[model samples]
Target chain A: KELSKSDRTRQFIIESTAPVFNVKGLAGTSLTDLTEATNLTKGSIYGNFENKEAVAIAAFDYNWGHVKSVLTAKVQACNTYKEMLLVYSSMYNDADGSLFPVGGCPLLNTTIEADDTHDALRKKAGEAILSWKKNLVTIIKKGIQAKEFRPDTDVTKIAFSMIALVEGAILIHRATKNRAYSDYVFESLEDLIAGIEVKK
Target chain B: QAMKELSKSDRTRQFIIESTAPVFNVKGLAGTSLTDLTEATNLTKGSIYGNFENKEAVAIAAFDYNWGHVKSVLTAKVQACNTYKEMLLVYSSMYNDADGSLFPVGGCPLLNTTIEADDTHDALRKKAGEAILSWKKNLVTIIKKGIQAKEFRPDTDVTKIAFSMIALVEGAILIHRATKNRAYSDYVFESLEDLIAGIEVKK
Candidate 1:
């Protein structure tokens, strides 16, 4: 059976509205922004999804797809765990007319904003975060097994450092409107990678 | 106007800062509205502006409230011993014991605000971010002092290590706040203490 017109419209709504959800968040995102984003009336949005929550859920996936693509391009650039650390060497400054790096990390933006305020989005975003964390941890563990890192390396601590540094670097960069924080975090990341570089 | 009743005006400003700290620390400046401000302080725009010029001014005040809380709490909590080891010890010990901390307002205000408002509210977030940057600088200064005083190993990566500590501590605090589990905090502090324990110089 073929999909209906409304179903295709809903898919377009999800794609067009992805960036809004990434920046404004679930609660912060408004119906008006949806209208502005999708170039559709609220009636059209409702005609596709039951409510704002329905569109938000779809938007979450769309926004998240944007986020994953950020890493996918960079992650494909290198093969080493050390190189993987460069995945977040970002310098997006909102004041400078630049798009936010990684759409400001959907996991951090959504999860922190919704952690206590919105449990449903909180759990949804949390699941994504832990999955991301595991990805880094696994690479670190692989580096250790391959003798690329110290066998006694603290994978979780390093994971926490990378997550906080990346998420934090982005946040601080946003808050200060300074590109230096991005370089500072990348510097710290480089230092961590040095520990994993093959011995001379 | 400045007043003869130092306690009255000062305390009123403090009250405004304290109540608004949570609001700015969480939802962020752009996320906050006049209605949210009213709910936070039970003060209308008129009353809020009575205390400060505008939303940015009020946010600056709230940040001062948080930054002052961190400085005063850490200053008093750290013992008066004059060595870097003692300094690091006091810092590590403070994490395990959380009295007089700015915890209820959540993690470091600078970290929270910088992350949210950095690129959003440039003026307000920049003012607040200076404090966290100063904090990291101060930590490095203390370590430098220690290395000069021969209290720390000369070979140590003092700057990177300090960055690590600041990053871990703030990150762990963020984690604990989200998890709301004291045990998670205890384990984190253990990692901190272990970091310190491993950094000792030979006698």
Candidate 2:
């Protein structure tokens, strides 16, 4: 698809400042910081964005898309439901935050920071979570249909656990700078996956 | 018996902390302002400074006060349960409770502080770490007690399970607060219930 001049500019803003939004959060980042980050003039930054909120919403999508692409690629390469579930724990083994947008999981970062402060960003984060949960639920339900998972397994609860545990583990890891905190939680997550598996 | 004596300054100090404790839980360290504190407690800037060393002092005292209040709630909740397993079950029930009084008015102080303080505020970050450590210890003790009573699996790692429970509950609150979806919280609580169920001895 051909990118319009304004679309190109918007993409540029999102790409350049995704890190800032994730790191500084909604409260911490300033308009000057965004302008300096993109090397654009204050006038250009404002002309491109109706307000700070506009840029934040776009930045969140960009950051979230980056996360989904990586996880989706890993998930797509897997052939089994169990393999797909294992991707989360396996990918989590690597602690290098480089693959992630600046701060950490945008969903977790944005959600935590914006929960009580900003309404627009919070809604976007919520949408991201809902989509993420829907994706996982679909996979688990498909797995059950294929006899890979137990028929009695509660799909909604399993889906919720995967999201909660991953976010929780990330929260613990990022806050404490302790890989063990996340690793230990991942062990339990893997155990959860195994417990739900059907014995052939 | 004579009562312990307090300076007029001590009374004012205690008053400031009690008044602003809930504010910090809701507004966060950065979100909170000196003006808000002063206005809330109706103290002059000079008076405020006279009582504490600085705002950090008040915030620390606030975190301790907030954390202690949180613990008391959990302590009371745990005391009512018969088995350690049931005690763990209390979180699953209350984690979903939207009733502000049962939990903190804002959310879990440990969670709110941990995320907000992670990179920005070192002192508050350390306070959060300490809070988590204390919480983890509390859970570990319960599991050990359960093991002693032969009610829980003997070989289970108490620390590991504690970490999972805390992570799940905190994570759920993170999502629930952001989404305003009660169902998401219920889902996570169900998971916690399942986790507790797994730890119990087979019937």
Give the per-residue Cα lDDT of candidate 1 at A64: 62
| Residues B1-203, model 2: lDDT tens digits | 01112323778888998899878877776667889898988877777777787888888898888888878878988999988888887875555555556776677778777766776778888888878778888899999999889899887877789999988888788879878987878888888888878888879
Q: How accurate is candidate 1 locally (lDDT)?
A: 0.65
Backbone clash total, candidate 1? 7
Query: Candidate 2: where are CA atoms >4 Å away?
Result: A93-95, B1-8
Give stretches of model 1 more than 4 Å off.
A1-7, A25-28, A49-60, A90-103, A196-200, B1-10, B33-35, B43-46, B80-83, B89-101, B154-162, B177-203
Reference interface contacts recovered per candidate: 0.20, 0.52
Best by DockQ: 2
Clashing residue pairs, backbone N/CA/C < 3 A, model 2: none
Q: Against the true structure, whose TM-score is highest?
A: 2
DockQ of each: 0.32, 0.57
- For residues A161-192, could you state the per-residue lDDT of candidate 1 as single tens digits? 56655665555455545566555655666665
